[PDB]
Amino acid sequence: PLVNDPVYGSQLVTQLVNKVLLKGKKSLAERIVYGALEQARDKTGTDPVITLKRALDNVKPALEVRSRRVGGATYQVPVEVRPDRSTTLALRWLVGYSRQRREKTMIERLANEILDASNGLGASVKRREDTHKMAEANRAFA
């Protein structure tokens, strides 16, 4: 358990901040995330932690393939994704893909990735879809 963030009382917000943080400066990651959330609020006029959960619903994977040794060879076998990992991945994707967006600032790119994901659009959502598709393709038997 990480802490409930002091503004919204959310552990999801705390983990987002941690995913945005590169090489030390907590203040800068906070500014990016609270900034992004306030932009979401401005756009929708609703609670941005609800927006963020809507994005996470669309981006969290339920199944994935994972490498496993079987009989001395390696196979990528479909497995359930545990809810902690599923959340981590979805945050990693939202952040990662936001970095290739066209908007001018990181605030605006993260906000707009979150907003698009909350509507079932963009690359984070496509990555979920593709993760599930691989899980389905790698079922050994029909």
Side-chain angles (χ1 to χ4, degrees), residues 63 65 76-79 132-142:
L63 300 165
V65 299
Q76 300 182 270
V77 303
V79 295
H132 281 6
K133 281 181 169 91
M134 183 75 89
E136 183 71 2
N138 278 39
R139 282 166 56 85
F141 305 107

Side-chain angles (χ1 to χ4, degrees), residues 8-22 24-56:
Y8 297 123
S10 167
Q11 289 170 285
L12 293 179
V13 170
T14 299
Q15 189 171 185
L16 184 49
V17 171
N18 295 338
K19 260 67 190 180
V20 165
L21 177 152
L22 291 169
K25 41 259 165 284
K26 195 87 187 294
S27 268
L28 170 54
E30 288 176 337
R31 193 79 271 284
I32 289 166
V33 337
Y34 290 106
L37 293 168
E38 172 185 18
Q39 184 164 328
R41 191 198 299 275
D42 296 343
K43 169 67 163 167
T44 71
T46 60
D47 177 357
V49 29
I50 293 183
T51 303
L52 177 61
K53 289 178 174 179
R54 287 177 187 143
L56 285 164

Side-chain angles (χ1 to χ4, degrees), residues 46-81 83-103 105-121:
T46 60
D47 177 357
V49 29
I50 293 183
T51 303
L52 177 61
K53 289 178 174 179
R54 287 177 187 143
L56 285 164
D57 294 339
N58 275 293
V59 179
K60 285 163 71 186
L63 300 165
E64 65 186 325
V65 299
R66 286 306 277 288
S67 285
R68 190 174 285 186
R69 306 277 286 169
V70 191
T74 304
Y75 299 84
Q76 300 182 270
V77 303
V79 295
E80 289 183 358
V81 187
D84 288 5
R85 179 175 167 71
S86 181
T87 295
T88 301
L89 289 174
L91 294 169
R92 279 178 19 198
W93 304 337
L94 284 168
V95 172
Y97 291 113
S98 79
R99 297 196 196 283
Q100 305 167 39
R101 295 183 65 105
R102 294 194 300 180
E103 296 88 2
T105 62
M106 197 46 84
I107 283 169
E108 291 161 88
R109 291 186 294 272
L110 179 60
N112 285 352
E113 192 65 15
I114 290 169
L115 288 158
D116 281 0
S118 76
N119 291 120
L121 295 162

